[PDB]
Amino acid sequence: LHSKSSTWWDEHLSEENLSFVKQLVSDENKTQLTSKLNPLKDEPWPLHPWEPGSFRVGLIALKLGMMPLWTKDGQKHAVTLLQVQDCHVLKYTPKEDHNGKIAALTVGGKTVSRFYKPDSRLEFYRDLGLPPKQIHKIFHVTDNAVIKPGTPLYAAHFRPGQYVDVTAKTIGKGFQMGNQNRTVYGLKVWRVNTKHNIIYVNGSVPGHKNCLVKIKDSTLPAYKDSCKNLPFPTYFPDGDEEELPEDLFDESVWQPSEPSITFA
Amino acid sequence: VYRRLGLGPESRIHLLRNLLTGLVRHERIEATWARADEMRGYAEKLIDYGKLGDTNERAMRMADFWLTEKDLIPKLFKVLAPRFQGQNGNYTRMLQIPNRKEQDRAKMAVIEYKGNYLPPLPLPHRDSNLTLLNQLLLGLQQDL
Amino acid sequence: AAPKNRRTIEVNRCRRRNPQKLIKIKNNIDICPECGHLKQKHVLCGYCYEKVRQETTKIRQQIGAQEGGPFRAPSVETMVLYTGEKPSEKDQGKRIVERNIKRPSWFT
Amino acid sequence: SPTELTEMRNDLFNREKSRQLSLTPRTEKIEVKHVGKTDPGTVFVMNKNISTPYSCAMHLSEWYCSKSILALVDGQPWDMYKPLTKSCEIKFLTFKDPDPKEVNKAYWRSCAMMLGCVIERAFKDDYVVSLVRAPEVPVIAGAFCYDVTLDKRLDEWMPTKENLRSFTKDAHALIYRDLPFETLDVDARVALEIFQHNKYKVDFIEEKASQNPERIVKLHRIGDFIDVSEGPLIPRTSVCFQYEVSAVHNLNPSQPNLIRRFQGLSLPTHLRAQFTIWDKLVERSRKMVTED
Amino acid sequence: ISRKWEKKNKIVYPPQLPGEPRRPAEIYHCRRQIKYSKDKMWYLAKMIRGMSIDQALAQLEFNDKKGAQIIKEVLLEAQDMAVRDHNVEFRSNLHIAESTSGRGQCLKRIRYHGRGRFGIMEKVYCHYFVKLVEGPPPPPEVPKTAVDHAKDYIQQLRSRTIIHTL
RNA sequence: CACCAACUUCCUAAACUUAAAUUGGGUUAAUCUAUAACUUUAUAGAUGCAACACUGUUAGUAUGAGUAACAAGAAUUCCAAU
Ligand SMILES: [Zn+2]
């Protein structure tokens, strides 16, 4: 029949070629990620000093789960685990062209396979030089804090002791429900694991385990300007002004291998 | 992790027991796709029990209960288990068959034990490397 | 439950001719090289599969006659041999099934 | 003007068709037996030099027409639209055959011929563009190559990214046009006259005439454009699904004329490729391809 | 009962002159008595309208409804007679010009109920009408572009005629 | 410092005055007879002579509706098989 036929990427791939295709895909992912490792060495846009009223960009992270965390006071606090995976800046929108009040930056993480995605999405990412990301989210960022697209974002952008706002889609329960975007406000960060980009956040976060979430600085009036004492645009490992510890702890948090806490 | 089958939990196992016994006897059974998928895991684990050893007392209790016909019990430990010693898994091959034309249009599948003496099933074949697209991919592979 | 008035054919015609209620076309139809008949991309050919089952029934019939009794499943491996093929030393210690037909071309 | 050459080229192509039609008197019945794997042994009584393999495909089913790109007449590759000549054994070739190497060559040659058509009409009539030949390169090379000699005025001009895209637009339009590949076997004397102005085409006609005992040469026509062919070509231009003009490499010996070898890649509808795979293939098709 | 669909297949056109184009073949085939609802058969008929002979056969082969199997048999019969009697040279060169279903004579029975009630039992029968035209199916419709729509509106404004004036 | 608006009124052609039981008068569809007519008509004489409506009667076909609704233990080597 002179009619359309349904095809998949593996339909016409032979076993020998199929194995090669997998190797080629891995090579492309490695090369693209390495090229984007150094943002400051890739003609970075000018970075401006902090002033009151500036807003930093947010990140997208994966919810590993929850585990118990102890403080130096001996109390046990359940903490949720958030992992930042392949977080990169993708598209910058000018202040006028997006919203007269403030500009926005698009950030996507959690790289995904290219086999089962539309060519349009791949075309945009090919220009960006990065592999496709699972989720695209828009973050309001002031002009001074704008960062060139393709800059890798890491969990070190946030720091222990900082309250943060996490919004994620709630678990769907079917006809009975759920599956609605919700935000939890005022969650403190207990610890950050730089090597695996894991942020330890007080309290529970909406959604199932392994569910992508959007993380942005706390918008509560009390924490209006916390970025003054934090990396103002973001944390750049490329700059390497001072290498951060692999695991970042809050002062109250009792690190493992510390002496047993005695209530004296 | 389990399909809701049978008038009760016992019926599912008894029905699975009936299905398992038939497959061992014949080594190739045609049944509804859902049943074949559900029982595929049991068949693979049963082969592991055969691999565990004939002397294993626990295997006999499992084999005795699951296999109503006791002539199969020697077969499992002396035919199925020796056959699959080299294999580390994938003992059962399950393929989708066109739905039954019995006015209910049930989804059909065929489950067989690999290494059997029965004629080979008409398995699907991937495209040959001689194809133009594969030949082009071969050139790219050679250059890299 | 009946509407307070008869439903007009015009109203009814629109309901049944809405695209949601019409039969959809399928584009996943494929050809089977083995049988030369049609197949679905995710469904195996039945014309060739029918041959396998028919041969299986014939093979099973021969086994049943050879066993000669119920609950006589051997504890030893089984093998099938066709006319023109004779039991070999490798076939020793395995139940041997003899088929009057010659070795089928598809069967190896 | 190039348009005048196409007009006279088209006419001689048409007159040759009439002469061949007049050459055959009446309709002669030839018994062609289907040796194809599927439905083997069917015998069609067909009109000699009139019936084509496509007609036989029409007789059987539409599936045959869609999936058949070539025909094996007595074990010889025959174009789907080439009139049958005698009682023979006919088999249909598809892109998914176990050994499509014969099909690959026909697709390879047809793609090169399509590229040649784009070049001649891409440039303005003011400039002089002469097609030299279509080099034969393996499919493994990753790109099909067409050689063309430009005028001195274009010696300093190299296609830009937009210019390359323009070439693809012409090629894409040709595929969209879906022009069937007309096939004619013509003697050298007529063929030389048809391409008398292009001296490079003249020698290629002589080479083909030299190889065979007669002077008959294989001429293929896409619309107005006509070209010589080393072998059988694709029935229609619509077969190609993806088309790209990867790059152009200028041959170093450009003193008499600047000989450019253009690199392109194309894929049939039967063999679609993923976006990333196509991108890598296009990148791999931008490298100079030598003939070995 | 009326059987004029068959009579449409018995129509014989006058001999065409040498300077007259070859008339496209038209085949009228129908199954008068089918133990099936016409409405259900109509749904199958509606989808297959305008499709090619090969495409319709392929779609029917993988259809789950009983009516679809009946249509395939009817379609296969129509194709056979078309080549046998209507001089269809190529089997593939056929398309479904028309496909529709009609009501058939039914049977009347009373449906008893276990608790003293009763119902009206009816045995439904239907007719199936198809006309097949030799040749490929006609090309599908192309939606109007913005330019086409805009031009018509301007033409309509120009086409306006003044009302009840000298 | 006007205009609009009713068949009120005027104007051309015409017309000659505004609820409902009841009461006077002139026609007519259809069928048949007498006697004619002869693409379907006339003069007389007749009648089972005209129905959107009698808890009216018979037949056809819709709507609710393709809705309510309904159904056979497993495998195989096979429905008087295991
Ligand atoms: Zn097959």
Side-chain angles (χ1 to χ4, degrees):
Chain A
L1 291 171
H2 313 292
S3 78
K4 185 262 186 175
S5 167
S6 62
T7 190
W8 56 102
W9 73 285
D10 269 350
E11 185 178 22
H12 316 290
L13 283 176
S14 81
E15 295 288 352
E16 296 81 9
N17 300 157
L18 172 54
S19 78
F20 163 56
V21 161
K22 294 146 171 171
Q23 174 255 334
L24 170 53
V25 165
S26 67
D27 285 355
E28 183 174 26
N29 283 355
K30 170 210 158 183
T31 56
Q32 280 172 359
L33 284 163
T34 55
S35 86
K36 305 296 163 173
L37 274 175
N38 292 341
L40 299 181
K41 307 303 170 294
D42 190 13
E43 281 60 46
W45 290 354
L47 277 299
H48 303 95
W50 170 86
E51 56 266 10
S54 302
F55 300 115
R56 311 195 296 160
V57 75
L59 318 177
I60 303 177
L62 183 145
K63 179 193 171 185
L64 294 180
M66 297 201 66
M67 76 159 49
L69 191 148
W70 283 275
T71 60
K72 291 175 170 59
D73 289 6
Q75 321 291 339
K76 188 171 81 66
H77 296 97
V79 71
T80 178
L81 310 182
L82 289 160
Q83 178 159 3
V84 190
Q85 297 195 354
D86 308 348
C87 196
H88 284 89
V89 183
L90 321 173
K91 182 181 188 192
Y92 166 65
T93 70
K95 168 175 176 184
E96 303 88 3
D97 295 332
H98 170 67
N99 186 30
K101 293 190 283 294
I102 190 165
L105 274 166
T106 76
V107 191
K110 182 66 169 306
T111 50
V112 293
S113 175
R114 306 190 287 259
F115 295 127
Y116 278 83
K117 306 296 185 178
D119 297 9
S120 56
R121 196 166 299 279
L122 301 183
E123 288 150 21
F124 153 82
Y125 267 101
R126 175 174 51 80
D127 308 336
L128 182 60
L130 278 169
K133 308 296 193 55
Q134 189 160 319
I135 291 183
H136 290 93
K137 284 307 203 73
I138 297 165
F139 301 88
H140 297 144
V141 181
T142 47
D143 170 30
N144 54 2
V146 176
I147 302 156
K148 183 163 166 182
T151 291
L153 299 179
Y154 300 89
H157 170 89
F158 303 101
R159 296 301 177 76
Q162 175 176 3
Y163 289 72
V164 70
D165 290 347
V166 180
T167 183
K169 266 200 141 169
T170 65
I171 288 168
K173 297 174 180 181
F175 200 115
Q176 298 296 321
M177 179 155 60
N179 200 28
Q180 306 140 14
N181 284 288
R182 287 292 189 290
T183 305
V184 174
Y185 300 83
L187 302 187
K188 168 189 177 147
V189 174
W190 286 113
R191 139 180 177 182
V192 188
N193 169 291
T194 304
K195 173 182 178 45
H196 307 296
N197 294 296
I198 321 297
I199 303 167
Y200 295 5
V201 180
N202 194 44
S204 299
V205 165
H208 59 92
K209 307 213 308 294
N210 306 318
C211 192
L212 281 62
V213 307
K214 199 177 87 168
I215 304 171
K216 61 174 73 167
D217 285 323
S218 190
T219 74
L220 274 66
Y223 303 100
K224 190 182 295 306
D225 269 325
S226 53
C227 52
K228 62 177 292 300
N229 309 309
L230 294 156
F232 164 54
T234 183
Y235 179 78
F236 289 100
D238 186 12
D240 269 328
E241 59 280 3
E242 286 89 0
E243 182 181 351
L244 284 178
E246 171 170 354
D247 290 330
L248 309 169
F249 283 81
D250 170 80
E251 287 64 56
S252 59
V253 169
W254 165 88
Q255 298 147 358
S257 67
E258 282 187 54
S260 180
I261 293 165
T262 184
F263 310 110
Chain B
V1 298
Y2 68 101
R3 291 182 171 78
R4 302 208 296 104
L5 317 170
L7 315 187
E10 180 144 33
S11 168
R12 171 159 162 282
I13 289 294
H14 287 357
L15 277 161
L16 283 167
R17 153 161 83 177
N18 288 297
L19 291 160
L20 187 41
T21 303
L23 179 53
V24 168
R25 168 159 303 287
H26 306 98
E27 303 187 28
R28 180 178 300 161
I29 298 299
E30 294 67 36
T32 50
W33 186 100
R35 304 296 76 68
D37 188 74
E38 193 75 343
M39 191 260 288
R40 199 184 185 166
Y42 283 91
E44 301 277 325
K45 290 155 187 182
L46 176 75
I47 296 304
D48 293 336
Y49 266 92
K51 284 162 180 228
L52 273 179
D54 203 350
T55 57
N56 189 4
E57 63 276 15
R58 203 185 63 270
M60 184 62 72
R61 296 180 61 265
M62 194 78 75
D64 190 27
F65 172 89
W66 279 93
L67 292 163
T68 49
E69 301 161 343
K70 310 315 181 184
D71 51 329
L72 309 175
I73 314 294
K75 173 165 158 182
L76 165 71
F77 296 114
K78 295 143 200 177
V79 184
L80 296 178
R83 181 189 316 172
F84 294 118
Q85 290 306 334
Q87 313 197 14
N88 280 346
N90 320 309
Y91 318 117
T92 62
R93 180 189 299 290
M94 181 195 151
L95 302 164
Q96 177 168 354
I97 305 301
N99 282 34
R100 60 174 59 156
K101 275 77 72 176
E102 290 168 37
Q103 195 262 330
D104 67 299
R105 306 295 300 165
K107 200 175 195 263
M108 302 312 297
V110 60
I111 193 168
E112 68 159 25
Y113 286 162
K114 290 186 199 156
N116 63 44
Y117 60 89
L118 306 165
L121 284 175
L123 316 179
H125 287 94
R126 270 198 182 277
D127 270 326
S128 164
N129 283 259
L130 303 180
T131 61
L132 183 85
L133 170 53
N134 289 129
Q135 288 298 279
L136 282 160
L137 277 169
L138 172 54
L140 177 55
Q141 159 71 45
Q142 286 153 345
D143 280 331
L144 292 187
Chain C
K4 202 83 196 179
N5 274 286
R6 162 169 186 283
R7 296 178 83 187
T8 78
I9 180 59
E10 296 84 2
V11 167
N12 290 343
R13 197 183 281 91
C14 285
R15 186 190 58 258
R16 55 178 64 92
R17 292 182 191 200
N18 179 311
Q20 180 267 329
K21 301 206 178 286
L22 298 171
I23 301 185
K24 292 74 176 178
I25 284 181
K26 73 183 81 75
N27 56 1
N28 54 11
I29 300 177
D30 196 10
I31 289 179
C32 174
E34 292 74 3
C35 49
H37 288 92
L38 292 189
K39 69 183 303 299
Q40 270 173 114
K41 291 149 173 285
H42 63 291
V43 180
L44 268 62
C45 179
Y47 173 105
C48 299
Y49 178 73
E50 187 55 35
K51 308 180 316 206
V52 180
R53 179 46 176 226
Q54 286 149 342
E55 190 48 33
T56 292
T57 56
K58 295 295 145 202
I59 289 165
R60 277 195 190 119
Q61 280 141 20
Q62 180 70 357
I63 283 170
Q66 290 157 338
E67 280 203 8
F71 320 106
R72 308 287 217 289
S75 61
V76 69
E77 305 280 347
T78 307
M79 171 174 323
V80 174
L81 292 180
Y82 287 76
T83 43
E85 310 172 323
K86 298 78 178 189
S88 67
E89 63 277 17
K90 292 152 187 165
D91 312 342
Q92 291 295 323
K94 312 184 43 170
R95 172 170 65 173
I96 308 308
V97 180
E98 287 301 333
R99 307 278 302 103
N100 49 11
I101 306 165
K102 188 258 170 191
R103 170 65 61 102
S105 62
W106 53 282
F107 174 54
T108 309
Chain D
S1 297
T3 182
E4 308 170 347
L5 266 178
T6 64
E7 190 265 333
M8 68 86 68
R9 270 146 190 185
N10 272 332
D11 300 339
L12 302 187
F13 201 103
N14 299 351
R15 280 88 166 96
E16 178 60 25
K17 285 150 49 55
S18 288
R19 164 266 198 188
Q20 296 177 348
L21 194 59
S22 307
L23 179 67
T24 43
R26 205 176 284 274
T27 60
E28 306 92 3
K29 302 292 190 178
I30 57 183
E31 304 266 337
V32 60
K33 179 175 205 176
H34 194 246
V35 70
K37 190 267 288 175
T38 184
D39 298 348
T42 67
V43 182
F44 317 82
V45 310
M46 288 280 109
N47 297 344
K48 177 173 164 298
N49 284 46
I50 294 152
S51 52
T52 72
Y54 201 75
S55 76
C56 308
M58 289 288 299
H59 268 284
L60 293 166
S61 84
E62 174 177 358
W63 288 99
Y64 280 100
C65 305
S66 71
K67 304 299 181 63
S68 60
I69 296 90
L70 272 188
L72 269 181
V73 161
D74 288 345
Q76 298 306 126
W78 279 45
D79 309 308
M80 275 292 293
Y81 300 128
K82 189 205 162 178
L84 301 167
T85 65
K86 63 193 199 59
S87 165
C88 56
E89 315 293 302
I90 197 173
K91 163 181 309 180
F92 285 100
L93 294 173
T94 81
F95 268 118
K96 289 301 189 180
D97 283 354
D99 177 21
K101 181 185 184 185
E102 306 306 324
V103 173
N104 301 339
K105 290 152 178 179
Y107 189 72
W108 205 255
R109 293 193 216 92
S110 313
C111 286
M113 182 195 172
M114 288 150 61
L115 194 159
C117 166
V118 165
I119 285 168
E120 81 169 14
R121 313 213 157 93
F123 292 121
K124 304 176 62 55
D125 310 333
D126 294 331
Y127 317 104
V128 163
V129 55
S130 62
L131 324 174
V132 63
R133 184 174 73 246
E136 194 81 18
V137 296
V139 172
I140 305 303
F144 51 77
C145 292
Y146 201 78
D147 301 325
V148 169
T149 69
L150 291 193
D151 186 9
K152 296 293 103 176
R153 289 175 264 190
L154 311 173
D155 286 346
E156 64 277 19
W157 170 89
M158 306 306 143
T160 67
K161 303 185 297 300
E162 296 77 12
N163 309 145
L164 285 196
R165 273 187 286 281
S166 83
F167 296 133
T168 69
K169 188 94 177 300
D170 307 325
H172 278 298
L174 207 67
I175 297 165
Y176 169 83
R177 281 173 77 87
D178 179 23
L179 312 164
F181 287 68
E182 294 163 302
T183 62
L184 280 184
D185 285 331
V186 185
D187 285 330
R189 284 83 55 78
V190 189
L192 299 153
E193 299 152 11
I194 294 162
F195 292 138
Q196 76 294 32
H197 287 121
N198 193 351
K199 307 298 145 187
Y200 307 104
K201 279 289 153 281
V202 168
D203 63 58
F204 194 80
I205 296 162
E206 295 292 1
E207 296 303 317
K208 287 311 201 150
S210 81
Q211 296 312 319
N212 47 8
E214 312 96 4
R215 315 303 294 172
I216 209 76
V217 174
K218 299 174 135 201
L219 276 296
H220 281 71
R221 168 165 86 159
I222 297 160
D224 315 310
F225 174 83
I226 315 179
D227 198 343
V228 190
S229 79
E230 205 85 27
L233 297 197
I234 297 303
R236 319 181 65 82
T237 56
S238 57
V239 163
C240 313
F241 175 66
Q242 293 172 355
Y243 205 100
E244 187 65 19
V245 170
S246 53
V248 306
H249 283 104
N250 296 5
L251 300 186
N252 289 352
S254 52
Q255 304 83 15
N257 264 338
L258 196 153
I259 321 182
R260 313 176 82 97
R261 172 164 296 167
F262 288 11
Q263 297 77 56
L265 259 187
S266 176
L267 268 173
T269 55
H270 295 82
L271 307 173
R272 301 192 282 275
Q274 204 263 339
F275 170 82
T276 69
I277 301 173
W278 182 241
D279 287 359
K280 299 284 171 296
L281 289 166
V282 167
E283 291 158 7
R284 179 258 201 280
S285 73
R286 282 157 172 152
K287 308 147 160 50
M288 181 65 191
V289 179
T290 68
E291 266 188 346
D292 299 334
Chain E
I1 67 166
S2 63
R3 303 294 176 253
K4 296 177 181 178
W5 207 249
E6 283 72 334
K7 302 218 161 175
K8 292 170 86 80
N9 197 9
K10 311 171 195 171
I11 294 165
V12 175
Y13 301 74
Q16 285 178 303
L17 318 182
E20 188 176 351
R22 192 163 200 86
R23 175 150 301 111
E26 296 201 321
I27 302 91
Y28 298 82
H29 191 235
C30 47
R31 182 165 294 182
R32 292 302 180 161
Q33 291 303 117
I34 310 151
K35 181 75 206 55
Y36 208 64
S37 181
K38 64 185 168 49
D39 190 358
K40 291 163 185 162
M41 201 73 79
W42 189 95
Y43 274 105
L44 290 158
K46 175 56 168 278
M47 176 194 72
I48 64 183
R49 282 169 196 186
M51 282 166 34
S52 64
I53 183 61
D54 309 288
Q55 183 201 354
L57 286 166
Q59 298 297 309
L60 283 167
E61 169 169 342
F62 298 91
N63 210 318
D64 301 334
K65 287 190 180 297
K66 175 177 80 70
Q69 176 59 33
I70 294 158
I71 294 170
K72 176 155 52 59
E73 298 161 358
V74 162
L75 184 61
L76 288 165
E77 296 158 11
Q79 184 166 16
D80 189 359
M81 56 189 70
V83 172
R84 184 170 62 70
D85 306 321
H86 296 95
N87 181 32
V88 173
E89 179 161 24
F90 309 99
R91 306 185 316 194
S92 80
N93 206 31
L94 282 154
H95 72 274
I96 296 90
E98 306 203 36
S99 84
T100 192
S101 65
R103 182 182 181 276
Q105 294 187 354
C106 300
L107 313 169
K108 279 72 183 170
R109 317 275 191 270
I110 180 165
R111 188 188 307 99
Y112 304 79
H113 287 84
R115 293 290 89 196
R117 306 291 295 163
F118 66 108
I120 313 311
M121 173 175 290
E122 195 69 29
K123 313 309 304 165
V124 63
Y125 291 76
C126 75
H127 293 41
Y128 192 70
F129 298 164
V130 294
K131 183 201 90 175
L132 299 189
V133 169
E134 182 269 6
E141 184 63 26
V142 56
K144 288 173 72 178
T145 63
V147 181
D148 309 332
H149 273 285
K151 290 165 155 35
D152 295 4
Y153 174 76
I154 285 148
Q155 287 170 0
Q156 188 273 326
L157 283 172
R158 290 169 176 277
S159 287
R160 287 184 297 155
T161 70
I162 191 63
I163 306 167
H164 301 144
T165 194
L166 180 56

